Short mmCIF file of C-alpha atoms and ligand atoms in Angstrom, two decimals:
data_model
loop_
_atom_site.label_atom_id
_atom_site.label_comp_id
_atom_site.label_asym_id
_atom_site.label_seq_id
_atom_site.Cartn_x
_atom_site.Cartn_y
_atom_site.Cartn_z
CA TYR A 1 0.23 0.01 -0.24
CA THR A 2 2.91 2.19 0.42
CA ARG A 3 3.53 0.37 -2.83
CA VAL A 4 3.05 2.08 -6.65
CA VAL A 5 2.34 -0.07 -9.81
CA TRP A 6 4.01 1.80 -12.84
CA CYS A 7 2.56 1.61 -16.40
CA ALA A 8 5.41 0.91 -18.88
CA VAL A 9 4.76 1.33 -22.96
CA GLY A 10 6.36 -1.22 -24.85
CA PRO A 11 8.78 -3.60 -24.08
CA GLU A 12 12.01 -1.33 -23.84
CA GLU A 13 9.89 0.79 -20.70
CA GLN A 14 9.46 -2.77 -19.21
CA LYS A 15 13.02 -3.27 -19.29
CA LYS A 16 14.09 -0.10 -17.50
CA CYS A 17 11.07 -0.39 -15.32
CA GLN A 18 11.11 -4.00 -13.93
CA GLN A 19 15.10 -2.71 -13.59
CA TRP A 20 13.77 -0.01 -11.46
CA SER A 21 11.33 -2.67 -9.63
CA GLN A 22 14.44 -3.93 -8.19
CA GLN A 23 16.76 -1.12 -6.65
CA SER A 24 13.16 0.05 -4.75
CA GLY A 25 13.10 -3.49 -2.78
CA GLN A 26 10.00 -3.29 -4.75
CA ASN A 27 8.18 -0.46 -3.51
CA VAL A 28 7.41 0.45 -7.26
CA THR A 29 5.98 -2.44 -9.79
CA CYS A 30 5.60 -2.69 -13.25
CA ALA A 31 2.18 -3.07 -15.93
CA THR A 32 3.10 -3.40 -19.78
CA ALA A 33 1.00 -2.72 -22.08
CA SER A 34 1.61 -1.82 -25.96
CA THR A 35 0.23 1.55 -25.95
CA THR A 36 0.13 4.81 -23.99
CA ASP A 37 -3.68 4.26 -24.28
CA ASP A 38 -4.17 0.70 -22.91
CA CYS A 39 -1.78 2.37 -20.04
CA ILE A 40 -4.52 5.10 -19.02
CA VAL A 41 -6.94 2.19 -19.45
CA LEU A 42 -4.82 -0.16 -16.45
CA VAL A 43 -4.68 2.90 -14.69
CA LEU A 44 -8.73 3.46 -14.72
CA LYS A 45 -8.90 -0.10 -13.49
CA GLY A 46 -6.61 -0.12 -10.61
CA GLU A 47 -4.37 -2.38 -12.54
CA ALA A 48 -2.08 0.24 -12.68
CA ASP A 49 -0.65 3.66 -10.60
CA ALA A 50 0.66 5.85 -12.66
CA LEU A 51 2.84 7.01 -15.63
CA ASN A 52 4.31 10.41 -17.13
CA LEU A 53 2.28 11.33 -19.94
CA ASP A 54 2.78 14.06 -22.89
CA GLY A 55 0.16 16.98 -22.12
CA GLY A 56 -1.55 15.14 -25.20
CA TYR A 57 -2.85 11.94 -23.50
CA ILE A 58 -3.40 13.85 -20.13
CA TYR A 59 -6.17 15.42 -21.76
CA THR A 60 -8.02 12.27 -22.67
CA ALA A 61 -7.15 10.89 -19.43
CA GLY A 62 -8.37 13.83 -17.55
CA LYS A 63 -11.87 13.43 -19.51
CA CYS A 64 -11.78 9.82 -17.78
CA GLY A 65 -10.76 11.46 -13.98
CA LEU A 66 -7.40 10.67 -13.96
CA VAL A 67 -5.19 13.81 -12.39
CA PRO A 68 -2.09 15.36 -12.61
CA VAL A 69 0.55 15.05 -9.51
CA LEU A 70 3.47 15.87 -10.05
CA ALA A 71 5.32 17.85 -13.19
CA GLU A 72 8.62 16.98 -15.43
CA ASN A 73 10.89 19.84 -14.50
CA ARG A 74 14.59 20.29 -16.50
CA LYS A 75 17.01 22.85 -15.69
CA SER A 76 16.97 27.13 -15.31
CA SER A 77 18.39 30.39 -15.71
CA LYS A 78 15.46 32.11 -14.20
CA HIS A 79 13.86 30.10 -11.19
CA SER A 80 17.01 30.10 -9.92
CA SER A 81 16.93 30.19 -5.85
CA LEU A 82 13.96 27.96 -5.73
CA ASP A 83 15.04 24.22 -5.83
CA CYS A 84 13.56 21.69 -7.88
CA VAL A 85 10.41 20.05 -6.52
CA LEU A 86 9.21 23.22 -5.43
CA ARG A 87 10.26 25.51 -8.73
CA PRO A 88 7.83 26.47 -11.11
CA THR A 89 7.74 24.57 -14.65
CA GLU A 90 8.35 26.67 -17.56
CA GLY A 91 7.08 24.48 -20.39
CA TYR A 92 9.22 23.40 -23.82
CA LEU A 93 9.04 24.96 -27.77
CA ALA A 94 7.25 23.03 -29.78
CA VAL A 95 9.58 23.56 -33.46
CA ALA A 96 9.10 22.48 -36.69
CA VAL A 97 12.94 21.49 -38.21
CA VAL A 98 14.16 21.12 -41.58
CA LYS A 99 17.25 20.59 -43.27
CA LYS A 100 19.37 23.60 -43.61
CA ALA A 101 20.71 22.28 -46.93
CA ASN A 102 16.79 21.82 -47.65
CA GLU A 103 16.38 25.93 -49.15
CA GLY A 104 13.21 27.00 -50.00
CA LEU A 105 11.09 24.94 -47.76
CA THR A 106 8.88 26.99 -45.32
CA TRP A 107 6.28 27.23 -43.66
CA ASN A 108 4.11 28.13 -46.44
CA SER A 109 5.37 25.23 -48.88
CA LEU A 110 4.82 22.08 -46.79
CA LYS A 111 1.67 20.75 -48.58
CA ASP A 112 2.77 17.71 -50.11
CA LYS A 113 6.55 17.11 -48.55
CA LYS A 114 7.18 14.50 -46.16
CA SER A 115 6.19 15.01 -42.43
CA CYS A 116 7.54 12.74 -39.10
CA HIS A 117 5.76 13.40 -36.42
CA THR A 118 6.45 12.06 -32.56
CA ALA A 119 2.98 10.10 -32.67
CA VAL A 120 -0.98 10.39 -32.81
CA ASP A 121 -2.45 12.89 -30.02
CA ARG A 122 0.92 14.58 -28.61
CA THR A 123 1.26 18.19 -27.80
CA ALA A 124 4.53 18.86 -30.36
CA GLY A 125 4.30 15.89 -32.88
CA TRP A 126 0.67 16.48 -33.57
CA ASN A 127 -2.11 18.40 -31.77
CA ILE A 128 0.18 21.90 -32.38
CA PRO A 129 0.81 21.54 -35.91
CA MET A 130 -1.76 19.58 -37.01
CA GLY A 131 -4.13 21.94 -35.03
CA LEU A 132 -2.50 24.94 -37.13
CA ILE A 133 -2.37 23.23 -40.66
CA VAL A 134 -6.47 22.43 -40.42
CA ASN A 135 -6.82 25.96 -38.90
CA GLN A 136 -4.97 27.61 -42.45
CA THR A 137 -6.19 25.35 -44.80
CA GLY A 138 -10.18 25.20 -43.25
CA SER A 139 -10.11 21.66 -44.28
CA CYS A 140 -10.20 19.02 -41.41
CA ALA A 141 -8.88 16.47 -44.42
CA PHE A 142 -5.88 16.92 -42.75
CA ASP A 143 -4.77 12.89 -43.56
CA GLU A 144 -4.19 14.73 -46.92
CA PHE A 145 -2.13 17.48 -46.55
CA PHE A 146 1.27 15.56 -46.49
CA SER A 147 1.96 13.07 -49.12
CA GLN A 148 3.83 10.40 -46.57
CA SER A 149 4.06 10.95 -42.64
CA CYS A 150 5.54 8.66 -39.88
CA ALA A 151 2.58 9.34 -37.56
CA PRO A 152 3.02 6.71 -34.80
CA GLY A 153 -0.75 5.78 -34.16
CA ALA A 154 -2.46 5.93 -37.08
CA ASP A 155 -3.45 3.26 -39.24
CA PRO A 156 -0.82 1.46 -40.48
CA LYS A 157 -2.05 1.10 -44.32
CA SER A 158 -2.39 4.83 -44.52
CA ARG A 159 -0.08 7.21 -46.14
CA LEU A 160 0.33 8.81 -42.59
CA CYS A 161 2.39 5.91 -41.68
CA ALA A 162 4.30 5.39 -45.04
CA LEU A 163 7.33 6.93 -43.60
CA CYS A 164 7.32 4.64 -40.56
CA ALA A 165 9.81 1.44 -40.23
CA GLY A 166 8.86 -0.89 -37.16
CA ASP A 167 11.49 -2.47 -34.60
CA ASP A 168 14.32 -4.89 -36.66
CA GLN A 169 12.64 -6.62 -38.86
CA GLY A 170 10.18 -4.42 -39.59
CA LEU A 171 7.82 -5.50 -37.80
CA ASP A 172 5.18 -3.41 -35.24
CA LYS A 173 5.16 -0.68 -38.46
CA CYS A 174 3.96 2.40 -37.07
CA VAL A 175 3.43 1.53 -33.73
CA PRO A 176 2.90 4.28 -30.81
CA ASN A 177 5.64 2.84 -28.79
CA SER A 178 9.18 3.07 -28.63
CA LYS A 179 9.10 -0.28 -30.88
CA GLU A 180 9.34 2.12 -33.39
CA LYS A 181 12.03 3.63 -35.38
CA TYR A 182 11.04 6.94 -35.78
CA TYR A 183 8.64 7.23 -32.49
CA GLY A 184 8.48 10.27 -30.65
CA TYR A 185 10.87 13.11 -30.11
CA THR A 186 13.85 11.28 -31.18
CA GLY A 187 12.16 9.10 -33.76
CA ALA A 188 10.55 11.65 -35.45
CA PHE A 189 13.94 14.14 -35.63
CA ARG A 190 16.20 11.09 -37.22
CA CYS A 191 13.38 10.41 -39.08
CA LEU A 192 14.52 13.61 -40.78
CA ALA A 193 18.24 13.01 -39.64
CA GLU A 194 18.33 10.75 -42.48
CA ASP A 195 16.07 12.46 -44.76
CA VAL A 196 12.81 9.97 -44.70
CA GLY A 197 11.02 13.05 -44.26
CA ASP A 198 11.40 16.71 -44.84
CA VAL A 199 10.17 17.95 -41.84
CA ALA A 200 10.08 16.92 -38.28
CA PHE A 201 7.65 17.87 -35.72
CA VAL A 202 9.32 18.13 -32.10
CA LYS A 203 10.52 20.06 -29.67
CA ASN A 204 13.03 22.08 -29.21
CA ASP A 205 14.97 20.55 -26.59
CA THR A 206 15.32 17.25 -29.02
CA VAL A 207 17.96 19.07 -31.69
CA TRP A 208 20.16 20.41 -29.01
CA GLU A 209 20.36 16.95 -27.68
CA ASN A 210 21.13 14.75 -30.99
CA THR A 211 23.34 17.47 -32.51
CA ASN A 212 26.71 18.43 -32.04
CA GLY A 213 27.81 15.15 -30.74
CA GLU A 214 25.67 14.99 -27.85
CA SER A 215 23.64 11.84 -29.07
CA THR A 216 26.46 9.51 -30.09
CA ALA A 217 23.97 7.33 -31.62
CA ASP A 218 25.31 6.23 -34.30
CA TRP A 219 22.95 8.26 -36.52
CA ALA A 220 23.36 11.57 -34.52
CA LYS A 221 27.42 10.88 -34.64
CA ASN A 222 27.89 13.29 -36.86
CA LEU A 223 24.77 15.88 -37.30
CA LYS A 224 25.50 18.92 -36.99
CA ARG A 225 23.23 21.80 -35.43
CA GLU A 226 23.88 24.27 -38.02
CA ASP A 227 22.62 21.91 -40.83
CA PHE A 228 18.96 22.57 -39.37
CA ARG A 229 16.78 24.87 -39.71
CA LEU A 230 13.57 26.10 -37.43
CA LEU A 231 10.24 26.81 -39.61
CA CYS A 232 8.39 29.73 -38.16
CA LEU A 233 4.89 31.18 -39.08
CA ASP A 234 5.62 34.39 -40.60
CA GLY A 235 7.40 31.79 -42.77
CA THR A 236 10.95 32.44 -42.25
CA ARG A 237 13.98 30.44 -41.73
CA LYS A 238 16.29 30.91 -38.55
CA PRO A 239 18.57 28.97 -36.73
CA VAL A 240 18.16 26.28 -34.17
CA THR A 241 19.13 29.22 -31.94
CA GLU A 242 15.94 31.73 -32.50
CA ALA A 243 14.11 28.65 -30.57
CA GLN A 244 12.31 31.53 -28.69
CA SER A 245 11.01 33.71 -31.25
CA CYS A 246 10.62 30.70 -33.80
CA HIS A 247 8.19 28.27 -32.76
CA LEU A 248 4.91 27.28 -32.86
CA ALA A 249 4.12 27.09 -29.23
CA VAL A 250 5.07 26.59 -25.54
CA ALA A 251 3.69 23.02 -24.18
CA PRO A 252 2.69 22.16 -20.45
CA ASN A 253 5.85 19.44 -19.40
CA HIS A 254 4.53 16.07 -19.45
CA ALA A 255 3.79 14.63 -16.03
CA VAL A 256 2.50 12.00 -13.77
CA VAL A 257 -0.99 11.04 -13.91
CA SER A 258 -2.71 8.78 -11.69
CA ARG A 259 -6.53 8.16 -9.75
CA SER A 260 -8.11 10.92 -7.83
CA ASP A 261 -8.26 8.45 -4.95
CA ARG A 262 -4.62 7.61 -5.38
CA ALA A 263 -2.80 11.08 -5.87
CA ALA A 264 -1.49 11.35 -2.78
CA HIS A 265 0.05 8.03 -2.74
CA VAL A 266 1.74 8.43 -5.92
CA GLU A 267 3.17 11.24 -5.15
CA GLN A 268 4.26 10.56 -1.58
CA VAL A 269 6.18 7.47 -2.89
CA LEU A 270 7.39 9.46 -5.49
CA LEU A 271 9.25 12.00 -3.74
CA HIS A 272 11.10 9.69 -2.31
CA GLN A 273 11.47 7.25 -5.23
CA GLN A 274 12.76 10.50 -6.71
CA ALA A 275 15.56 11.35 -3.97
CA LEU A 276 16.63 8.19 -4.45
CA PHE A 277 17.32 7.46 -8.47
CA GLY A 278 16.80 11.21 -9.55
CA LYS A 279 19.48 13.67 -10.25
CA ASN A 280 21.66 13.81 -7.08
CA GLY A 281 20.15 10.77 -5.35
CA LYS A 282 22.00 8.48 -2.48
CA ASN A 283 22.00 6.02 -5.60
CA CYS A 284 22.08 7.72 -9.34
CA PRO A 285 25.02 7.95 -11.35
CA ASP A 286 26.44 4.62 -8.73
CA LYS A 287 23.45 1.98 -8.63
CA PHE A 288 20.29 3.53 -11.06
CA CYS A 289 19.25 7.04 -12.48
CA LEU A 290 15.49 7.19 -12.93
CA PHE A 291 15.97 9.74 -15.42
CA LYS A 292 18.84 7.94 -17.79
CA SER A 293 17.44 6.06 -20.45
CA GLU A 294 20.65 6.59 -23.18
CA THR A 295 19.18 9.29 -25.24
CA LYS A 296 15.57 6.98 -25.87
CA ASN A 297 13.36 9.24 -23.02
CA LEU A 298 12.23 5.51 -21.29
CA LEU A 299 9.61 6.44 -18.57
CA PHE A 300 10.88 9.90 -18.30
CA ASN A 301 12.72 12.70 -20.79
CA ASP A 302 16.14 12.02 -20.69
CA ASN A 303 16.40 15.83 -18.98
CA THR A 304 14.17 16.02 -16.32
CA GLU A 305 16.31 17.32 -13.58
CA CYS A 306 13.49 16.50 -11.00
CA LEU A 307 9.60 15.76 -10.62
CA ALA A 308 8.35 19.26 -9.27
CA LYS A 309 5.42 19.85 -7.12
CA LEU A 310 2.12 21.78 -8.71
CA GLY A 311 1.00 24.48 -7.24
CA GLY A 312 -2.43 25.38 -7.26
CA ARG A 313 -3.27 21.75 -7.15
CA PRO A 314 -4.59 21.82 -10.72
CA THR A 315 -7.57 20.10 -12.48
CA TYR A 316 -5.78 18.69 -15.83
CA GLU A 317 -7.77 21.76 -17.83
CA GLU A 318 -6.09 24.59 -15.55
CA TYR A 319 -3.08 22.49 -15.47
CA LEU A 320 -2.65 22.25 -19.21
CA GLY A 321 -4.35 25.86 -19.84
CA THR A 322 -7.03 27.27 -21.57
CA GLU A 323 -4.98 27.49 -24.75
CA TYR A 324 -4.48 24.62 -25.15
CA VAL A 325 -7.21 23.24 -23.83
CA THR A 326 -9.24 25.18 -26.99
CA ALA A 327 -6.49 24.09 -29.74
CA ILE A 328 -7.22 20.29 -28.30
CA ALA A 329 -10.82 20.87 -28.80
CA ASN A 330 -11.33 22.82 -32.34
CA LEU A 331 -9.77 19.54 -33.27
CA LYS A 332 -11.25 16.59 -31.78
CA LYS A 333 -14.15 18.11 -33.41
CA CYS A 334 -12.98 17.14 -37.09
CA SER A 335 -12.99 13.35 -35.88
CA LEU A 336 -16.41 17.54 -26.05
CA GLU A 337 -17.65 16.11 -23.19
CA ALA A 338 -16.58 12.77 -22.55
CA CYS A 339 -14.39 10.25 -20.98
CA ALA A 340 -12.74 8.35 -24.24
CA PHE A 341 -13.33 4.51 -22.75
C1 LIG B 401 16.47 24.49 -26.07
O1 LIG B 401 16.43 23.25 -25.27
C2 LIG B 401 18.08 23.16 -25.13
C3 LIG B 401 18.00 22.28 -24.82
O2 LIG B 401 17.11 21.88 -22.92
C4 LIG B 401 18.18 24.38 -24.33
O3 LIG B 401 20.27 24.25 -24.34
C5 LIG B 401 20.33 24.56 -22.73
O4 LIG B 401 20.19 25.41 -22.21
C6 LIG B 401 20.75 25.30 -20.60
C7 LIG B 401 20.58 26.72 -19.66
O5 LIG B 401 19.10 26.87 -20.45
C8 LIG B 401 22.15 25.31 -20.38
O6 LIG B 401 22.51 24.77 -19.21
C9 LIG B 401 23.50 24.91 -17.90
O7 LIG B 401 24.24 24.25 -17.06
C10 LIG B 401 24.78 23.09 -17.53
C11 LIG B 401 25.57 22.63 -16.49
O8 LIG B 401 25.04 23.15 -15.29
C12 LIG B 401 26.21 24.14 -18.22
O9 LIG B 401 27.31 23.35 -18.80
C13 LIG B 401 27.73 22.48 -19.62
O10 LIG B 401 29.24 22.71 -19.54
C14 LIG B 401 30.15 21.35 -20.27
C15 LIG B 401 31.89 21.65 -20.48
O11 LIG B 401 31.35 22.41 -21.53
C16 LIG B 401 29.27 20.74 -21.25
O12 LIG B 401 29.48 19.25 -21.31
C17 LIG B 401 27.22 20.93 -21.53
O13 LIG B 401 27.24 21.28 -22.76
C18 LIG B 401 26.95 22.35 -20.94
O14 LIG B 401 27.47 23.25 -22.01
C19 LIG B 401 25.49 25.04 -19.23
O15 LIG B 401 26.61 26.87 -18.85
C20 LIG B 401 24.25 26.43 -18.19
O16 LIG B 401 24.97 26.84 -17.66
C21 LIG B 401 22.14 23.70 -21.43
O17 LIG B 401 24.09 23.74 -21.59
C22 LIG B 401 21.52 23.80 -22.94
N1 LIG B 401 22.15 22.37 -23.24
C23 LIG B 401 22.85 22.40 -24.79
C24 LIG B 401 23.07 21.46 -25.03
O18 LIG B 401 23.49 23.39 -25.16
C25 LIG B 401 17.83 25.69 -25.12
O19 LIG B 401 17.85 27.02 -23.90
C26 LIG B 401 16.29 25.40 -25.06
N2 LIG B 401 16.03 26.92 -26.12
C27 LIG B 401 15.00 28.06 -25.56
C28 LIG B 401 14.53 29.32 -26.20
O20 LIG B 401 14.09 27.49 -24.92
C1 LIG B 402 -8.11 27.59 -34.66
O1 LIG B 402 -9.36 27.45 -33.86
C2 LIG B 402 -10.12 28.52 -33.13
C3 LIG B 402 -10.86 29.42 -33.88
O2 LIG B 402 -10.68 30.53 -33.04
C4 LIG B 402 -9.13 28.92 -32.00
O3 LIG B 402 -9.61 29.49 -30.33
C5 LIG B 402 -9.58 29.90 -30.23
O4 LIG B 402 -8.17 30.87 -29.15
C6 LIG B 402 -8.82 31.78 -28.35
C7 LIG B 402 -7.21 31.83 -27.43
O5 LIG B 402 -7.37 30.60 -26.96
C8 LIG B 402 -10.10 31.91 -27.63
O6 LIG B 402 -10.07 33.64 -27.08
C9 LIG B 402 -10.13 33.54 -25.57
O7 LIG B 402 -11.10 33.94 -25.62
C10 LIG B 402 -11.98 33.30 -24.19
C11 LIG B 402 -13.10 33.93 -23.93
O8 LIG B 402 -13.74 32.97 -24.36
C12 LIG B 402 -11.12 34.52 -22.75
O9 LIG B 402 -11.09 34.26 -21.92
C13 LIG B 402 -9.37 34.65 -23.53
O10 LIG B 402 -8.90 35.31 -22.53
C14 LIG B 402 -9.00 34.28 -25.40
O11 LIG B 402 -8.87 35.22 -25.49
C15 LIG B 402 -11.13 31.75 -28.70
O12 LIG B 402 -12.40 32.13 -27.77
C16 LIG B 402 -11.01 30.72 -29.15
N1 LIG B 402 -11.91 30.49 -29.66
C17 LIG B 402 -12.64 28.83 -30.28
C18 LIG B 402 -13.82 28.50 -31.22
O13 LIG B 402 -11.98 28.11 -29.85
C19 LIG B 402 -8.03 27.80 -31.74
O14 LIG B 402 -7.03 27.82 -30.91
C20 LIG B 402 -6.92 27.52 -33.28
N2 LIG B 402 -6.15 26.42 -33.37
C21 LIG B 402 -5.08 26.81 -32.97
C22 LIG B 402 -4.23 25.60 -33.18
O15 LIG B 402 -4.65 27.73 -33.35
C1 NAG B 403 10.73 0.86 1.00
O1 NAG B 403 9.69 2.00 1.30
C2 NAG B 403 10.16 2.37 2.36
C3 NAG B 403 9.14 3.46 2.86
O2 NAG B 403 9.94 5.08 2.72
C4 NAG B 403 11.51 2.93 2.73
O3 NAG B 403 11.52 2.51 4.53
C5 NAG B 403 12.78 2.42 1.98
O4 NAG B 403 13.18 3.38 1.74
C6 NAG B 403 12.24 2.06 0.57
N1 NAG B 403 13.21 1.15 0.03
C7 NAG B 403 13.62 1.56 -1.18
C8 NAG B 403 15.12 0.65 -1.59
O5 NAG B 403 13.08 2.46 -1.30
O1 LXC B 404 -5.25 27.65 -16.80
C1 LXC B 404 -4.26 28.34 -16.93
C2 LXC B 404 -3.31 29.03 -16.20
O2 LXC B 404 -2.87 27.99 -15.08
O3 LXC B 404 -1.55 29.35 -16.64
C3 LXC B 404 -1.75 30.82 -17.24
C4 LXC B 404 -2.48 30.11 -18.41
O4 LXC B 404 -2.82 30.92 -19.80
C5 LXC B 404 -4.08 29.46 -18.65
O5 LXC B 404 -4.94 29.16 -19.58
FE1 FE B 405 5.65 16.52 -25.81
ZN1 ZN B 406 5.32 32.31 -28.34
ZN1 ZN B 407 -7.97 25.44 -9.16
#
């Protein structure tokens, strides 16, 4: 009962979880699902306790009663005096990236180019970029804006899945979990890295993390930031250092969600867990680090300083904010009081 059940999405996270489970003398245990949605279901049922989510899935979750608990927080130059765990969360920039070498490509010349998405329903990989394209286009036929794409979660037999590749054998094509080569921030960015697609929808941290020898993965080894460009809304191309003035929007940090009749207990065990395998714990670098997955953002993003406390005891709408909630609303009608299960 001081014991928490985590929901691991996919085989790779199942493995980083069972590892965490050992180091905890099992104050943590794992449930496994092949997709984030099933993970949400397991939690509803009470068969699992929590998982960390991109704001896109939180929205879904909140309709079915789960609640924000703790948020991922990364390093800041403002809000420095404050400890991490109490520090306000800053959010992240949803950017759109292209290869510099690919001149002329602009936000205005994207109809029919090739896209790389983190997955369906996520914030920077989907709901932000598609909400805009649907919204400037007057259409809902957004499945027809990109001749070809990789968008984990969409129907395999569709064009949206044409650009994806499955694990080592080209099995599990387009599944919305890391087993897919082009799944999530890094997959999506590799997708452009290797010139599979013309554009990629990821967060800003992603470009910086896999370039100029930061990633050490063989596909990111020789990647050099200057070879990339951000596409702005005013149809302009700025270096990746201008993220602040050339972003599509800022997004709510991913966060741990749970059931309300559970929140308090997930929180308590977690801060303790965080104190031990977190950024400066009795056992991170020696025995086990909760935020190290090796450039693969397994369970938590790899750039998490710590899981922060919230503040006003958010209800997800507030946690996600009225801007974002609407962006998601006008978009899902193209498919409002709800759940989704
Ligand atoms: C886009 O997203 C990127 C990725 O998150 C942001 O870039 C990072 O910004 C941080 C603060 O804004 C930089 O962080 C600090 O803390 C570290 C150490 O505590 C400092 O130094 C390290 O020094 C060694 C030796 O040179 C190197 O290994 C490291 O690369 C680092 O330089 C650093 O001085 C700073 O005080 C962080 O370094 C930086 N990360 C990278 C890879 O550049 C970026 O701000 C964000 N942009 C926007 C507009 O939001
Ligand atoms: C494209 O679809 C709609 C069309 O407008 C966009 O939503 C609009 O977003 C703005 C800002 O969220 C809303 O304005 C707000 O009004 C409220 C009162 O309702 C006020 O409290 C706020 O201060 C703010 O000014 C506007 O009402 C809203 N309209 C609708 C119908 O949602 C949507 O965001 C667009 N999608 C994207 C991705 O840009
Ligand atoms: C297991 O939980 C109890 C309660 O906090 C605690 O005594 C102990 O530190 C935990 N063990 C580990 C390895 O976290
Ligand atoms: O709910 C909100 C919040 O908590 O932060 C500022 C926002 O703009 C908003 O919509
Ligand atoms: Fe995200
Ligand atoms: Zn802005
Ligand atoms: Zn409130």
